Design a protein around this ligand. Structure first.
Ligand SMILES: O=S(=O)(O)OC[C@H]1O[C@@H](O)[C@H](O)[C@@H](O)[C@H]1O
Ligand SMILES: [Ca+2]
Length: 485
């Protein structure tokens, strides 16, 4: 029973840490988990977007088995059943105090959230004893903190209303009042304005509750330190959802100019500082040697994701997906293949593993560690030994997902079905919409340059058979292209 901390960054690409040898960014605090722990070269989220990757981590279920597991608005209902087995529920029944701090994006309420009372079901009802959260994303209304289902700084004399349907009569928008903007929108992100930054969706009221983006990193770090100190004498499971480098990239003043890459780079150094502050505080509390730390990212990277923040102009030679094709929103490997480090000081011996592992496996793997009785019916597989770096093999195969489109990794091979859709979305990311069943040897062709399906017809038919069996009932040959907000 060590403490367990799952740290998720938000769109942090395979090439957005220096752990794998990048010359174009420096993430020393994050790299210390990688070098001093298990550094996974073949670590995966299930999905190339937030809500589905986070759903798979929390439930141990493939998210494409839930029709609601896609990018959620801030007023979306909770997509996990109140009765369903979850990572925090398991840890709690095995003697842990549970906390979720930072990004949520799994939904809250039952479709008519009153932001002025306790919002249920939420984190509390899926097994987090403590929560202090962003409902959806830092670019989505409501721009407030939700602590155990209550909006921080709410006020009956300035009540909060949210709509993703239309503006509140009388309320300024990015379009009505462009003079109020300190950051320009590039596409979407042109509804309500908060702290000079235009957002997705419309918000009225709660002047007191409205967050300040530049102090968000510090506010969650302080909630994390409060949680650790409150529970230092107990076994705790903390889910720490960093907002960086998700748009808007408005990091604290002290991080501005730390990089050559504008707000995007500066937000990554902000996240690295949060990780450094966590490690420092664990050392201070004397907990480092009894705390298992898992660091990862919900999905692959993106430069321009809706704001004129200089990300494409100032990227220079920086390859955020570190040589992988695509990125956020892509069915190519850069969508799901993310940094993944597992660290336990004095227990795990430093290792670089090529084991095919997925965030979805943490529920069954941690379950094995703490002696859980798992229900039947989870996708989550027990690979505890691979996660501890004791064994260098885990999965033979993994399904990957990009906004409802599915593909297949099996050993050194990726099979992508063909899908009708755009080559790129407005971000410039390649979506992985190909015209034929394609096959990539990712041992030799890391960057998925070449569809070699033609010279491997036997292997292709087999990978198609296995993919159809695992996805039947969920796989859709035609998937609606969801517009960026
Ligand atoms: O990391 S995620 O939460 O999946 O990102 C969600 C994205 O949704 C898109 O509609 C917006 O254009 C992006 O700016 C971003 O907010
Ligand atoms: Ca994300």
């Amino acid at each position: 029973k060590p403490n367990v901390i799952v740290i998720l960054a938000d769109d942090l690409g395979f090439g957005d840490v220096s752990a794998y040898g990048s010359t174009t960014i420096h993430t020393p605090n994050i790299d210390s988990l990688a070098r001093g722990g298990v550094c996974f070269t073949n670590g995966y989220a299930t999905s190339a977007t937030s809500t589905p990757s986070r759903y798979a981590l929390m439930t141990g279920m493939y998210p494409w088995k839930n029709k609601d597991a896609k990018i959620l608005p801030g007023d979306a209902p909770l997509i996990i059943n109140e009765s369903q087995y979850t990572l925090p529920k398991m840890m709690r029944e095995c003697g842990y105090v549970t906390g979720a701090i930072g990004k949520w994006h799994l939904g809250m309420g039952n479709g008519n959230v009153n932001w002025n009372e306790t919002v249920k079901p939420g984190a509390k009802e899926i097994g987090f004893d403590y929560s202090c959260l962003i409902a959806a994303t830092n670019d989505r209304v409501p721009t407030v903190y939700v602590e155990n289902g209550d909006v921080v700084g709410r006020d009956p004399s300035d009540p909060i209303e949210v709509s993703y349907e239309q503006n509140f009569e009388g309320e300024p928008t990015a379009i009505s009042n462009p003079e109020m903007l300190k950051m320009q929108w590039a596409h979407g992100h042109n509804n309500s304005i908060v702290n000079g930054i235009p957002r997705i969706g419309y918000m009225k009221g709660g002047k007191k509750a409205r967050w300040k983006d530049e102090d968000m990193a510090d506010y969650f770090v302080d909630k994390v330190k409060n949680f650790i100190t409150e529970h230092r004498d107990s076994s705790f499971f903390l889910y720490y959802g960093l907002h960086e480098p998700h748009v808007p990239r408005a990091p604290h003043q002290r991080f501005v100019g730390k990089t050559t890459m504008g707000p995007r780079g500066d937000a990554i150094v902000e996240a690295d500082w949060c990780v450094g502050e966590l490690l420092t505080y664990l050392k201070k509390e004397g907990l480092l040697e009894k705390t298992l730390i898992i660091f990862s990212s919900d999905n692959g990277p993106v430069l321009n994701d809706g704001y004129k923040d200089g990300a494409p102009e100032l990227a220079g030679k920086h390859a955020p997906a570190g040589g992988l094709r695509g990125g956020k929103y892509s069915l190519f490997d850069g969508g799901t293949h993310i940094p993944l480090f597992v660290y336990w000081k004095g227990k795990i011996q430093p290792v670089k593993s090529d084991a095919l592992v997925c965030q979805m496996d943490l529920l069954a793997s941690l379950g094995s560690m703490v002696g859980a009785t798992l229900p039947d019916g989870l996708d989550s597989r027990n690979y505890l030994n691979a996660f501890m770096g004791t064994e260098l093999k885990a999965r033979e195969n993994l399904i990957i997902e990009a906004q409802g489109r599915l593909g297949y990794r099996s050993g050194d091979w990726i099979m992508m079905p063909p899908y009708k859709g755009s080559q790129r979305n407005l971000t410039g990311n390649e979506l992985g919409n190909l015209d034929e069943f394609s096959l990539f040897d990712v041992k030799s062709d890391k960057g998925q340059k070449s569809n070699v399906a033609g010279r491997h017809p036997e292997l292709l038919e087999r990978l198609k058979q296995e993919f159809f069996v695992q996805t039947d009932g969920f796989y859709r040959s035609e998937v609606e292209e969801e517009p960026l907000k």
